[PDB]
Design an enzyme around this catalytic site. Structure first.
Site, PDB file in Angstrom:
ATOM      1  N   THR A 198     -10.429  25.092   8.539  1.00  0.00           N
ATOM      2  CA  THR A 198     -11.608  25.359   7.735  1.00  0.00           C
ATOM      3  C   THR A 198     -12.020  26.809   7.927  1.00  0.00           C
ATOM      4  O   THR A 198     -11.567  27.466   8.860  1.00  0.00           O
ATOM      5  CB  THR A 198     -12.771  24.465   8.165  1.00  0.00           C
ATOM      6  OG1 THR A 198     -12.981  24.615   9.573  1.00  0.00           O
ATOM      7  CG2 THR A 198     -12.466  23.012   7.857  1.00  0.00           C
ATOM      8  N   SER A 199     -12.883  27.304   7.048  1.00  0.00           N
ATOM      9  CA  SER A 199     -13.352  28.679   7.146  1.00  0.00           C
ATOM     10  C   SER A 199     -14.102  28.835   8.473  1.00  0.00           C
ATOM     11  O   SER A 199     -14.591  27.851   9.024  1.00  0.00           O
ATOM     12  CB  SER A 199     -14.275  28.991   5.968  1.00  0.00           C
ATOM     13  OG  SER A 199     -14.523  30.381   5.866  1.00  0.00           O
TER      14      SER A 199
ATOM     15  N   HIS B 275      -8.520  31.555  14.448  1.00  0.00           N
ATOM     16  CA  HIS B 275      -8.147  30.254  14.994  1.00  0.00           C
ATOM     17  C   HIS B 275      -6.909  30.540  15.825  1.00  0.00           C
ATOM     18  O   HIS B 275      -6.306  31.608  15.699  1.00  0.00           O
ATOM     19  CB  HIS B 275      -7.778  29.265  13.885  1.00  0.00           C
ATOM     20  CG  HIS B 275      -8.943  28.510  13.323  1.00  0.00           C
ATOM     21  ND1 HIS B 275      -9.676  27.606  14.067  1.00  0.00           N
ATOM     22  CD2 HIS B 275      -9.480  28.488  12.079  1.00  0.00           C
ATOM     23  CE1 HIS B 275     -10.606  27.059  13.305  1.00  0.00           C
ATOM     24  NE2 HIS B 275     -10.507  27.577  12.092  1.00  0.00           N
ATOM     25  N   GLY B 276      -6.524  29.592  16.669  1.00  0.00           N
ATOM     26  CA  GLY B 276      -5.343  29.792  17.481  1.00  0.00           C
ATOM     27  C   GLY B 276      -4.990  28.630  18.380  1.00  0.00           C
ATOM     28  O   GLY B 276      -5.722  27.645  18.466  1.00  0.00           O
TER      29      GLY B 276
ATOM     30  N   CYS C 263      -9.137  29.352  19.921  1.00  0.00           N
ATOM     31  CA  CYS C 263      -8.874  28.191  20.753  1.00  0.00           C
ATOM     32  C   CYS C 263      -7.546  28.422  21.459  1.00  0.00           C
ATOM     33  O   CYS C 263      -6.771  29.292  21.058  1.00  0.00           O
ATOM     34  CB  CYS C 263      -8.820  26.924  19.892  1.00  0.00           C
ATOM     35  SG  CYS C 263     -10.432  26.406  19.198  1.00  0.00           S
TER      36      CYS C 263
END
EC number: 3.4.22.56
Lengths: 5, 141, 92, 93, 140, 5
Positions: free
Chosen positions: B29-30, B88-89, B130
């Protein structure tokens, strides 16, 4: 609210 | 000397890569509120005399190209190097707007041997992302 | 001669294998703390000591709020990984 | 409450993915450095600053010597992983 | 601020020194490691830690020991120190007979599983390989 | 001599 990353 | 020489003409660069929107293929998600972060970092590093550069929504490929180009630049007159990644990650992975990108790949462009003008100088990577799907419940003090 | 992996510092927003938290309007807990601590101590404390403060602020002042019991009341601890060989001071 | 992973410090002799070196006579480069630096600074330097000195000593004063060209002239840099929330001093008030 | 280090005791310092491994592992004797273990014992003794040296522990015995230590009462101790000297790989430490993930060992000391150490510094000093890459260094 | 771990 708090969300995951 | 116990301290890094920070009295060069310039403190150095501060590349901030803020990815908020992702390709439908990824599924993530954004990342609302991430602009508040990128903006906060810019102001902070500006006070520390860093040359800040914001880059928004970069694909996995555009990330590597940016890092490689920055690493091939001449930092002879800069005290250090800062790189912020907001995205993100997963463990060791950072997400471009289109797909996964290993972290070791980005940092390697800056190894003492691949970036002579930064050898012996502080290279900082602040990574907001993350690193797995584990949840920390905490404990009462 | 020095190690090619020397002089690198990795400040991770969270511990290995864990989720990192972000507030929809205020932003990520880590960057918030990091910017706040930087604004307050960059003119005094060495970087590692400033990052330790970020660790404490994040660890003590943040807790997740979610309408889903699963992701509710969760904590976070940042992770500093240093391969620096000297002290880092932003002032002179 | 606090994170269950808080207050942990991992002093790694080497960088993630790398070999760690040991002298067949004097012992591991990291332990030697760590002990010299502690004995010399534990009475006044904070732990993180002490491990930074260990980082510098290992990275600058050690180079491998091996009869095997493959493992000869190699370097090492320790890796400090801190989840500490406060400063760590081994001395008192 | 700083950790409270004025408890009756500084804490325990567990040193696990593995020199000899079972041939199946393929790792020859870690000569020089005894000098290390002895060095660490003397160092932590001067810092007032109750040092406990353990030599050649199987992977089962390492987990057994850490479990027992995490169950002792550290209420009157300021911190905890654990030194592991042995062969290893990323996230892995070797017992005399086999590998053990470091995560399994440190988890015994998580804030929720060792209440007498919650809020207290837990130091893990790890001397061991974390892979097979070689750093060739660069000149200046 | 120096050996790896």
């Amino acid at each position: 609210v708090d969300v995951a990353x | 000397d116990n301290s890094y020489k920070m009295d060069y003409p310039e403190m150095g660069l501060c590349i901030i890569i803020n990815n908020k929107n992702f390709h439908k293929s990824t599924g993530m998600t954004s990342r609302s509120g991430t602009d508040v972060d990128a903006a906060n970092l810019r102001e902070t590093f500006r006070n520390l005399k860093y040359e800040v550069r914001n880059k928004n929504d970069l694909t996995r490929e555009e990330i590597v190209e940016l890092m490689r180009d920055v690493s091939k630049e001449d930092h002879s007159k800069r005290s250090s190097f800062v790189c912020v990644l907001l995205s993100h990650g997963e463990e060791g992975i950072i997400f471009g707007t289109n797909g996964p990108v290993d972290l070791k790949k980005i940092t390697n462009f800056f190894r003492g041997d691949r970036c002579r003008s930064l050898t012996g100088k502080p290279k900082l990577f602040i990574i907001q992302a993350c690193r797995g799907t584990e949840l920390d419940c905490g404990i009462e003090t | 001669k020095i190690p090619v992996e020397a002089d690198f510092l990795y400040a991770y927003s969270t511990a290995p294998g864990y989720y990192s938290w972000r507030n929809s309007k205020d932003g990520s807990w880590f960057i918030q703390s990091l910017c706040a601590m930087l604004k307050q101590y960059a003119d005094k404390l060495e970087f590692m000591h400033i990052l330790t403060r970020v660790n404490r602020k994040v660890a003590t002042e943040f807790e997740s709020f979610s309408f889903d019991a699963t992701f509710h009341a969760k904590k976070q601890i940042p992770c500093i990984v240093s391969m620096l060989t000297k002290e880092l001071y932003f002032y002179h």
